[PDB]
Structure formats: C-alpha cells, structure tokens
Amino acid sequence: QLEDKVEELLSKVYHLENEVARLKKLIENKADMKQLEDKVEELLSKVYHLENEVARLKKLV
Amino acid sequence: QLEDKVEELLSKVYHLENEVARLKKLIENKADMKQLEDKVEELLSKVYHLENEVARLKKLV
Amino acid sequence: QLEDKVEELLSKVYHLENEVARLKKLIENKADMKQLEDKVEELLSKVYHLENEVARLKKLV
C-alpha cells in the first residue's frame, strides 16, 4: 500500500501542474504595477496643469 | 526508507497545495490589464478634448 | 521500480516549487484592483469637474 500512497501523490502532483499552468495564464493577463503608476502619473500631471489654466482663465473672464 | 521519502513528498505536496490556494486568492485581487487599458483610454480621450477646448478658449479671451 | 516513480514525483515536486516561487514574484509586481479603482475614481472626478468649469467658461466668453 505504499503504491496506494504513491498513486495518491502522483494524482495530486498532476492536479497541481494544471493549477499552476492556469494561474500562470491568469497572471499574464494582469496589469503591471509600474504600468498603472506611469499612466496615472502622466494623467495626473495633465489634469493638474489643466486645473491651473482653467483657474487662470477664470481670473481673466 | 522509501516510506521516509514518500512522507517527505506528501508534506511538500501539502505545502504546495496551500501555496497555490493563497496565490489564487492574490491573483483574484489584481487588476485586469484590459480594465487598466480601457479606463486609461477613456480618461486620456476626455483629457485630450479638454486640452483642445482650453486651447480654443485661450484664443478667445 | 516504485523507486523509479518516486524519483519521478520528487523531480516534478521540485519543478513545481520553483514554478510557484517565480509566480509569487510575478504576482507581487502586479497592480491591486483597489489601487486601480481608487486612482481612476480620483482622476475621473477631477476631469468631470474640469469639464463643467470649461463648460461654464464657454458660456461667459
């Protein structure tokens, strides 16, 4: 019955391999943090400068 | 002592199952890249058009 | 030849441990969804309010 336990572990390993394979695919569809950071910084900067110009225009009208 | 090595692998498999389970939970809390892409594109478009209107308003004042 | 199969599983477990270790590193470089959500909400709000002020300024010029 060590055969019995080795079967058991054979099948657990098989399932783990499939689980890991699918997680790997899930991961590659997730966004990089550096990509979030860079895009948001760019947008934040453009929005900030727009706020200032709008502010200046309010003082002229 | 093949029993000894089969114990060893039993416990490594147990730990792997728990590791994989927790990574699965971590993954489901991460942002999809398509979601980052779509939101940023929308914001980028709105900001671009705002820049143009602000530009036009500067030429009128 | 149960030794033979136990070798086989020993090496599959070894490879899985390395695979899981590297995925764990990949995961920690991905963006949290709540972080995407919060940053985009903030930017969306600022853009919305800019659109309104720009709209109001167009009616004054």
Name the residue among A19, A31, A50 with its Cβ closest to that of B31: A31
B36: closest chain C residue by CA: C36
Half-sphere exposure of C19 (CA within 13 A, CB side): 21
Token pair for residue A47?
């929005």
Calculate the CA A41 to chain-centre distance: 17
Can you list the domains of chain C with their CATH numbers? 1-61 (1.20.5.170)
User: Measuring CA to CA, how many Å separate A41 from each of B27, B30, B40?
Assistant: 24, 19, 11
C51·B47 Cβ contact <8 A: no
Resolution of this entry, Å: 2.1
Measure in Å the smallest separation between the Cα of A29 and chain B Cα atoms. 6
Which secondary-structure segment (H or E) carries A8?
A: helix A2-28
Contacts of C19 (CB under 8 A, 6+ apart): A20, A24
Rounded Cα distance between A55 and A47, Å, is 12
A/B interface, count of CB pairs below 8 Å: 66
Contact between residue C10 and residue B5 where contact means Cβ atoms under 8 Å apart = yes
A22 in contact with B, Cβ within 8 Å: no
Instruction: Report which DSSP code applies to C29.
Output: T
